[PDB]
Symmetry: C3
Subunit: 114 residues, 3 copies
Amino acid sequence: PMFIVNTNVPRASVPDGFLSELTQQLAQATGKPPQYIAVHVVPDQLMAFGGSSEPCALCSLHSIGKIGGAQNRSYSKLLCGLLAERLRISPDRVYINYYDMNAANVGWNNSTFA
Amino acid sequence: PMFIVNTNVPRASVPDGFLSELTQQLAQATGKPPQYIAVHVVPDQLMAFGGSSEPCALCSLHSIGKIGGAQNRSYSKLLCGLLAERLRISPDRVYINYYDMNAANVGWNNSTFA
Amino acid sequence: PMFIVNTNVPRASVPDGFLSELTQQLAQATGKPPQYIAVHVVPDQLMAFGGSSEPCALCSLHSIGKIGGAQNRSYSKLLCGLLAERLRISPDRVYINYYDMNAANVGWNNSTFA
Ligand SMILES: CCc1cc(N2CCCC2)cc2c1N=c1c(C)cc(N3CCCC3)cc1=[SH]2
């Protein structure tokens, strides 16, 4: 699976270890070896929630299988704690981006992902 | 990949109050509270269209409801209209992609969204 | 989501004609005019895969119709080779992200593509 974190928080206020933690947490969450875990990070973004200078956190996860609307709460419940502890941002301003497209267009190495 | 708005136009071309009217008009059209929506735009990048390295724009219109031929057409004029007056970008140089979400797939506080 | 391309390769290691040769090949490969294919690039991104901080990269695109496993593979094969022999990247973990859409969901030139 692949996870990317987008936030308005400057790199200066961004600590270290979030990469490793996310890799291990996600691996045991999705049920896949850390070898298949892709982590993308990009701080200092020009985003504003509610039309104000309110801190926002965009979390996008891309994985095939083991997905559900009801399960989404439990999945995010394990992620909100991390962001609320590290960045201290409230889950209220967190939007989880996902996909449910057929695995027919989901491949790896010389192929395309969905 | 995740949702994000990018453009080759420098940040210096962005006037003050742009984020205000942008969200105001967006909320007014969508009919949804501005407190539930967020504005994200990363300028000063590199893009081209048809060989021409002229200023271009790409934007994702993720929402829930109000989808229709006429409705979508109205949003196109609203977006390109304001963009052409604030950022001075040609309507033929901006691409808008509409994305609808499930009613049970509402965001805000541990929830998945497009 | 959004069809954004990401790479760990910094602007200090990029070649020339990146928004020219690529689009030209992409257009010829698909059989569509390069004038109808937008091209944007986002470098200097920090990303890791499988725990390895090696220079990873993810590509994406959008097309209406003429898509599928066979079609996508016919395009990805060309992309992987071109990218490898251009940005000096390993083709072992090269993948794209082609996505489809609806004609009425495409806003262009103050109007819809519908
Ligand atoms: C789900 C797409 C797929 C996605 C992958 N990623 C990495 C993080 C971004 C999404 C990674 C893999 C993958 N699919 C396969 C498939 C399909 C087969 C594989 N092998 C290893 C040798 C045996 C066959 C290995 C992978 S790795």
